[PDB]
Every structure is written in structure tokens, then in C-alpha cells.
UniProtKB/Swiss-Prot annotation:
Active-site residues, record numbering mapped to chain: 130 (proton acceptor)
Domain remark in the UniProt entry: The autoinhibitory domain sterically blocks the substrate peptide-binding site by making both hydrophobic and electrostatic contacts with the kinase core.
Chain's gene name: DAPK1
Positions of the Protein kinase domain: 12-263
Complex formation: Interacts with KLHL20. Interacts (via death domain) with MAPK1 and MAPK3. Interacts with MAP1B (via N-terminus). Interacts with PRKD1 in an oxidative stress-regulated manner. Interacts with PIN1, PDCD6, BECN1, TSC2 and STX1A. Interacts (via kinase domain) with DAPK3 (via kinase domain). Interacts with GRINB. Interacts (via death domain) with UNC5B (via death domain). Interacts with UNC5C (via death domain).
Role this protein plays: Calcium/calmodulin-dependent serine/threonine kinase involved in multiple cellular signaling pathways that trigger cell survival, apoptosis, and autophagy. Regulates both type I apoptotic and type II autophagic cell deaths signal, depending on the cellular setting. The former is caspase-dependent, while the latter is caspase-independent and is characterized by the accumulation of autophagic vesicles. Phosphorylates PIN1 resulting in inhibition of its catalytic activity, nuclear localization, and cellular function. Phosphorylates TPM1, enhancing stress fiber formation in endothelial cells.
Name the record gives this protein: Death-associated protein kinase 1
Family: Belongs to the protein kinase superfamily. CAMK Ser/Thr protein kinase family. DAP kinase subfamily.
Amino acid sequence: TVFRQENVDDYYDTGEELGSGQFAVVKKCREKSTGLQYAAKFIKKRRTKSSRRGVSREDIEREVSILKEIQHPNVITLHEVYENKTDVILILELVAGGELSLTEEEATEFLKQILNGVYYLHSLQIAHFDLKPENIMLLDRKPRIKIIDFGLAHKIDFGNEFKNIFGTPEFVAPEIVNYEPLGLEADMWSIGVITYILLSGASPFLGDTKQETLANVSAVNYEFEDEYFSNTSALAKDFIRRLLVKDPKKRMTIQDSLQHPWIKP
């Protein structure tokens, strides 16, 4: 699939930088025709078939196709796509409040929005595969959150996928660490990690090196530290405990998480 090949600078003016990854930079921008503001994500293309630098066209097209499907208040939306020889430029909804220890009411206020967004995605059989605090942004810093960064997202048409998929060690599920088939359940593990950090300020599996962290993830090597959780409700801990489960089949689903007594009204 091809994208708009006019010069993006003829239609948008860029401003301050908003975000910056391995092969992508995000710039605030303004559409000349409407004055409306967006975030332009410049993704570097692979230059050769076997290069390791840049993002493969297959991966860029997958991200664009998924983004085109989504319209939900808790997930970033895609406005336009441009391209040239060096970059694909996604014109994305501007999320300007930056990245997301709290009281349980504050934590559940944000968590519920995360769950609503993930419920939408999983209902469409979209696994995000990169859920982590860095990918949970606010619109204005009770703020509105937006799930961002669909660079690892995959449609899960057969219940699972078996691809080269691997995010940030602190947040990946054991099946990712062990290179097993992956489904929607991996996102639910990541939500459990996010909830643990939201309530305590501490990362449940983090070791001194990436390999240690991954070994901890695979072994489900975490515990609730009393110094961090002494005033946290047992129901909150129950919610986390039913997500940080090694067997994906025994882990709470997104629907389970919405009906759990800590969440359900």
C-alpha cells in the first residue's frame, strides 16, 4: 500500500519534539489548511532488503493498517500518512500531556481508561504487545489517557501469533520471554505490571540487567513488598495476582479484568 508522496512540509509546519524512539521521532505539527494540531511520527525506512536499520515496509504497513481501524477515546487515532524515500510520516492525534505512587482511586481512575482502551482493541482482535507506562500518555496533565505506539501491534486472527515480537523486558509476558505463540493474553500481563507500578512506584520483575529481568519474568519472580503495599487493599493485590500468571490460559482476560470486584462498580 502506498501513501501520500507530496512533501509533508507543503501541508504541515512542525514544531517542538514530542517523543523519540529507535527509528522514529515525533514532532508537534500544525496543518496549514485547518490550523489543527497533530503529532507527526517520522519512521525511518529500511534502505535494503537485509538491512537491520530502519523499519521494514511490512512492519510499517501493519502499524498503519491497525491504526486506521481504531476510533476510541482511549487510543490514539491516525489522521493521514505521507511518505518519501527515507521516511513514512504518520500524522497522528496530538496527545500533549506527556507520559503517565497514587491512591487507589486515582490509580483505578487511570487503570479503568487503560482497560476500556484495551477492551476496544482486544474486541477487534488487536494485541498491542508494547503496553508500558511510556506508551500511556495523557491529553492534559482526572486527565484523559491515550494508548500510543502501535509499532508492535498485531491482528490475532487465529487466537495466537508466532512472529518476531519482543518489547521491553520489565513489561513483557513470560510467553514473549520464552518465544512462545502470543495472543491477547500478553497485554493482560503487561497491565498487571503497570498496575503494580501504579500502586507502589516499584517494578515487580526489574533486575540489575535485562537478562535478570527476563529471567525474573519467566519465573514469575515478584512479590508484594509490605513497605510499598502495606496500605494497599487486598482486592488491589488480588487484581494484580490474577494478571501476573504464567499460564496465559489462566490469566484474567480483559473482560475478566472489567468484572473483577476492584474494578466493577
